[PDB]
Symmetry: C3
Subunit: 355 residues, 3 copies
């Protein structure tokens, strides 16, 4: 129960003050006490979790507890807590929730940035709290689709202390050895859902430099840069593990394989050479259907128009991903078995693969 | 005639000063007097409208009139008028026009921004006028084309007090209830003509959230943001009203319909469900042509390669928009009437529609 | 040899001081002396050119020479030399090289920008040198490919005093008369390799305004803009001179021709009208191959799916660039010679050309 709890934290704050050493050393010890308690106790975001009727009962005890700590100490504590300490002593939970609410989406009544920090007035007539640090945004990968033509991924900023439009975002590919880097511009965003089209024709020339490419979201605020590793929060990955995309580069074949890391479950891209006939079989089904089968893993191809090229003939077709390791190319006419063996080239809607 | 006119405005300025109340209250009343007169009288942009020979005759009378108002008052008047008041008293119309000229395109001899405001020196050797506010840009929609694959729109900033390169622009879709938002990056710009390619594959996932999407141009200068509603100034809209684009989304069909609002003639996008066979007929013409007819409104499709898919066969074709509600798909071979009834799938160059 | 050389420069610095005129006029004459010597002598970048063992022998003599010039003068010399003058007197070549190293890629131990200038601490514990100007980046065009559908060019910043991520870049097309302009956004970048996809459908409407379009790279740092003319440093151009791309615009045909200027060997784009049948021949080879031959210059087309349209029939094909002025369209079926003469329309994968 609230005031039985904050009763206790009040007395602990009292004894830190009546310990036996200097004045300013007690507040530093005390300042660390409420950085942690507001970060890791019941107090964090109580105005959004507790239902609205019981929260009046919460702010009284918090108020008497926060009344016990001197106003001096609000300068050494983490900057984003100064408003909550102030409305705690004032037992003002319309504004206390507003603040905790204001941090989640970055919607303040009035605000602006100064020196890369926030100055916020949370409601009309209330003071401005100045110099509030900007914490790292939480990112959830809410979509991830890919084929042999592009990768489409959606990253959703679930929590960020600053609203849409005042920051820039890019998708960052960082090699595991940190030596090489790729940046993909934003394609479109709907509120805080950020969608990136990674065209493999754009990144084919740079991928061979390293095998492991880790995915980050870069978020820039003027010149303060956040590097957010992405993947550990996500919607359910839509493919069987090791599902890959076929890449063709300087007469050689490669696979691009998304996967999730062992230590922290983040998403990365594995790029390595293959031998096409060891990885994918090509067979004739009926007289007008070509079937591509991933032998060890699924390969996803873009659906739509396709063609097969012989040395003196060509046939159009329609490609469809019938299963996660099986692709059907429905040809526009019959192909004899003897000529099927002489396919020189296979094309999807945007890519060509010389056999 | 000029000095008969500015004669009068001089005497009106004289009587505001000889009214009977405090000193600073007269200038505020006076400051509002010339905010309006420069905004809504013959004086606005006279150096660009009047032909060059008669303007010398204008600046003398303006000079004697502006000579009557104290230099004190140039601090409470709208910031962008301070240069014109100064060159008025100086009866300097080479610089007066230069200023009015300088505001139209944002081409100053010397300038830079400070606190989101302009500090301008209009000619060599002349003073710097500091702290000039930036008014909202005028936008004209100079192109708007669309099909079932993308929207291409060109927005031209006809007037803006700051030159190309120092601001950013994005295309904003804002739901009528302000709840949801889409931002499209700039695709290319030629001087102050800004072209946006809105790929429907990029926005298909976000459109179903609301029916009405209003079009804005966002213009950002550091952190000062302008929201400009667009459409009321435009070149002639190139389609018959209610012309739409067909969208396919999770087995369901929709229309995306550009239109212009009743109250202020701005352009918006209407997204709503349809029943394909109630809206579009598909018929065979001759033996090798498929005709799509919009029954209630025209539907625009991307011209170029297309195909029709049957359950065990496929046929390529060429799509052409023969009229605004009629589309022809010229097939590569004949199709029997009995098989035309068994078309399972229809594809344009970039989109697929399962029947 | 080092100290025989810097011996001399020391004495020259001595006599500039013992000349007969004012104090501050000698330092200005002296300040210009070491702007040039560090810019155009053995001293420039010696810590990166000389091999590591012999450089200790270099910094002693430089030290005694730089010891002779007063510390007063480091304020009037070019800002980026202040660290090297300081570590010269200190004969500190671990830090001297670090600085020269730090300028090449823009990798400082600690730094930030202030007023569009750098404040740098080069190693842990060392002072901060403040107010360092940012010189123009060196640009090398490391790739340039094009066809009738897009231009793909890669620009590599070989040297830039500021690391990736803190600046923006755009590709600029500037008409020779400076009247018209085109800006192409960045498509992707890998470290300091910046790739631009210039879609001709995006720039077709703006190209007719002028014939000569010069290529620049714009680099923006807050509001300080660099205009870097590109082309004179490049990898070997991949096409024969005058190789062009065919453009179709309002029933008329044009060529877009990259070329390099006479005076400074920079790359530009020439846009001018042609008569299709005077520039490109179309002939039948065998019964299923259409050959496009550039008569006066090569024309590059995008490889992949293509089609030819007759007034009541259409044929798909595969386009391949067999030589730099010869293109083969391998049709899906035979075409009679009498119907080949009645081709109304020719399509590549993304473009259409009405004959």
């Amino acid at each position: 129960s609230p005031e039985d709890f904050y009763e206790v934290m009040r007395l602990i704050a009292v004894e830190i003050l009546n310990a036996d050493l200097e004045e300013a050393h007690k507040d530093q010890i005390l300042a660390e006490f409420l950085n942690r308690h507001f970060s890791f106790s019941r107090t964090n975001g109580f105005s959004l979790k507790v239902k609205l009727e019981e929260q009046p009962q919460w702010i009284n005890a918090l108020g008497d507890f926060i009344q016990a700590v001197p106003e001096r100490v609000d300068a050494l504590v983490m900057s984003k807590l100064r408003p909550l300490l102030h409305y705690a002593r004032a037992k003002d939970i319309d504004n206390y929730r507003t603040v905790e609410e204001s941090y989640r989406q970055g919607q303040y009544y009035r605000f602006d940035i100064v020196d890369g920090k926030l100055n916020i007035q949370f409601n009309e007539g209330e003071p401005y709290f100045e110099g509030i640090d900007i914490a790292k945004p939480k990112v959830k990968m809410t979509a991830f689709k890919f084929d042999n033509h592009k990768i489409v991924t959606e990253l959703t900023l679930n929590e960020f202390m600053i609203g849409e439009g005042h920051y820039d975002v890019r998708l960052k590919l960082h090699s595991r050895n940190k030596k090489h880097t790729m940046y993909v511009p934003l394609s479109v965003n709907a509120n805080k859902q950020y969608r990136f089209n990674i065209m493999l024709e754009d990144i084919k020339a740079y991928l061979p430099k390293e095998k492991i490419w880790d995915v980050f979201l870069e978020v820039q605020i003027g010149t303060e840069v956040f590097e957010v590793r992405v993947g550990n929060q996500r919607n359910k990955y839509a493919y069987t593990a090791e599902t890959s995309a076929l890449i063709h580069l300087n007469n050689d074949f490669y696979r691009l394989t998304p996967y999730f890391t062992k230590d922290f479950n983040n998403i990365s891209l594995y790029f390595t050479a293959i031998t096409l006939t060891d990885s994918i079989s090509m067979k004739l089904k009926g007289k007008n259907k070509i079937i591509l089968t991933g032998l060890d893993r699924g390969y996803v191809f873009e659906e739509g128009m396709a063609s097969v090229v012989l040395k003196d003939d060509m046939i159009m077709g329609m490609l469809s991903q019938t299963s996660e390791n099986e692709v059907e190319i429905l040809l526009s006419k019959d192909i004899k078995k003897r000529d099927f063996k002489n396919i020189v080239k296979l094309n999807t809607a945007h890519m060509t693969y010389s056999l």
